[PDB]
């Protein structure tokens, strides 16, 4: 069997802060932080709206976009790494609030930045080990309740956002090849500390980043196995239409297209709109990139990203 | 292709911690909570071991038993309700403390009390497709640490512990069928609202939970998943050697044994010994029924167990 994109949905909470609004609370620039990231706007999600509500509203745009009702999905995974709550998982949450009531499984995924490509993967398996037909994956993150807003290196970088994708069985592929990573000795370069334990938090409730130590190993790690993938498909990089890769930061993704031999006119990009939405980062950009004209049926797109852990993978598919 | 249980391994943190223990703490009795449960023990973890420790140990334990290094992992899933950190995986932690730097897939996946069903038929997708050949399966959970210790409705229940398996690829069926579900309408029924926002927990820190309906829910649930799998796979319940149920009520587990037509002798039965430990509940079982001398290999397992979600789900496997 194979998997293959259905349909595609995204949903950014209302207010949506550019860096001078942002200027206003934190000492840093707009011309800074477009420097560093390439980053110009963030959306911050609003006070009573949580993760399952992005994704909720995400995968509704995702189910239209493929013409399926609620009733006809088989399996539901959320990549988050900001869940509604410390259990049950967000994923059951978002299911009921499609009134999915056909007792189809769901469960969340914990692969941070990278998580999309992990649940993505993972429906891939389930599809084509005929374990479900049509899969619901969805890329939600609420960062912006897990930033140190006193902290102007990291505050700057990220948003809140979410992104789903349909992804159906097929006779023909959709997803050609696919190739995930994880190495835990780079914990301390990105992470949150903290867990809720004994009635309190314990540890550091906040995003801790080491930048120039993400920067150095995304790079390295990104054109590697973005190599890996294309040449075990039975590719090479001129066959790749598009690139849609995690939209952290603009300068990694530029050095990634680079290496590929890639002009950035064949690169998806939403981090100037977005910002580092972690897992829902490339279902946003996959999103985006449909509903611009901008990828079309038929084309070769290669999804890549790192994320905390670390993390990191990429996905070869046929849209 | 097929995946079979290559090794078990299990571990329980050091402080036993028995029912008249707990009377000191909380108005309650050990025949009351017997009478309710048949929990008679639980583990509590150390003031320094989290679930990743847990996570390792088990590992270990499962690596050995089934003759493998730690390098011939191609991948790790970590069923758990109680992760290490906000992010990144716990996964990736246990990853690293067992010193594997082959850069093999790591992630959490969120289930609760059903988690490792999830994670095993996850890992059993993986295996079919030829996306993995030898994966790492942990349920691992701390849960003491979300337990409100003044409440004598709930505290009584919950234990923390690990259960690992390695599973491979193989010629024959070991992994025969699954059947997954999920209902998130029953989320006021058990969870823990609480979570990491704005640099505090935001919403209760403790499980709540809604015995009778649990209760009420379960028997009927996984009598009917029970019934399903065999159904699908084409056995009979007569055909079954082993039930290795999720361990939270001895109750619960006898009215599903009765309603198969099964004797408690053909039940691995540890909840007197173990409690509630969500996701490292069956594994824990399972590992304890293979090194206790009761499951020998060409034997039918039925596992099964029901969690915080709804999220529930049945596992058919020849050992």
């Given at each position: 069997?194979?998997?293959?994109?259905?349909?595609?949905?995204?949903?950014?909470?209302?207010?949506?802060?550019?860096?001078?609004?942002?200027?206003?609370?934190?000492?840093?620039?707009?011309?800074?932080?477009?420097?560093?990231?390439?980053?110009?706007?963030?959306?911050?999600?609003?006070?009573?709206?949580?993760?399952?509500?992005?994704?909720?509203?995400?995968?509704?745009?995702?189910?239209?976009?493929?013409?399926?009702?609620?009733?006809?999905?088989?399996?539901?995974?959320?990549?988050?790494?900001?869940?509604?709550?410390?259990?049950?998982?967000?994923?059951?949450?978002?299911?009921?609030?499609?009134?999915?009531?056909?007792?189809?499984?769901?469960?969340?995924?914990?692969?941070?930045?990278?998580?999309?490509?992990?649940?993505?993967?993972?429906?891939?398996a389930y599809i084509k080990s005929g374990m479900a037909k049509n899969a619901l994956v969805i890329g939600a993150e609420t960062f912006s309740r897990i930033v140190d807003w006193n902290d102007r290196t990291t505050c700057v970088l990220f948003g809140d956002g979410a992104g789903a994708v349909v992804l159906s069985a097929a006779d023909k592929p959709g997803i050609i090849h696919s190739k995930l990573k994880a190495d835990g000795n780079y914990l301390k370069l990105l992470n949150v500390p903290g867990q809720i334990a004994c009635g309190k938090v314990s540890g550091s409730p906040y995003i801790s980043m080491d930048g120039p130590g993400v920067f150095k190993f995304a790079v390295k790690m990104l054109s590697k196995i973005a190599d890996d993938v294309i040449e075990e498909a039975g590719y090479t990089a001129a066959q790749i239409d598009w690139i849609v890769p995690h939209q952290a930061n603009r300068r990694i993704i530029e050095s990634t297209a680079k290496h590929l031999g890639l002009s950035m006119d064949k690169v998806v990009l939403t981090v100037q709109d977005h910002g580092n939405t972690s897992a829902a980062s490339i279902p946003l950009a996959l999103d985006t990139g449909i509903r611009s004209g901008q990828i079309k049926r038929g084309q070769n797109l290669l999804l890549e990203g790192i994320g905390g852990g670390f993390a990191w993978g990429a996905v070869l598919l046929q849209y």
């Open positions: 069997q194979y998997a293959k994109i259905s349909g595609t949905g995204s949903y950014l909470p209302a207010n949506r802060v550019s860096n001078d609004d942002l200027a206003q609370k934190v000492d840093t620039s707009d011309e800074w932080i477009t420097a560093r990231t390439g980053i110009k706007f963030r959306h911050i999600a609003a006070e009573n709206e949580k993760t399952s509500d992005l994704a909720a509203e995400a995968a509704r745009r995702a189910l239209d976009a493929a013409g399926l009702d609620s009733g006809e999905i088989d399996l539901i995974i959320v990549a988050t790494a900001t869940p509604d709550m410390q259990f049950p998982s967000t994923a059951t949450i978002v299911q009921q609030k499609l009134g999915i009531t056909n007792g189809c499984p769901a469960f969340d995924v914990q692969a941070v930045c990278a998580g999309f490509m992990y649940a993505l993967t993972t429906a891939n």
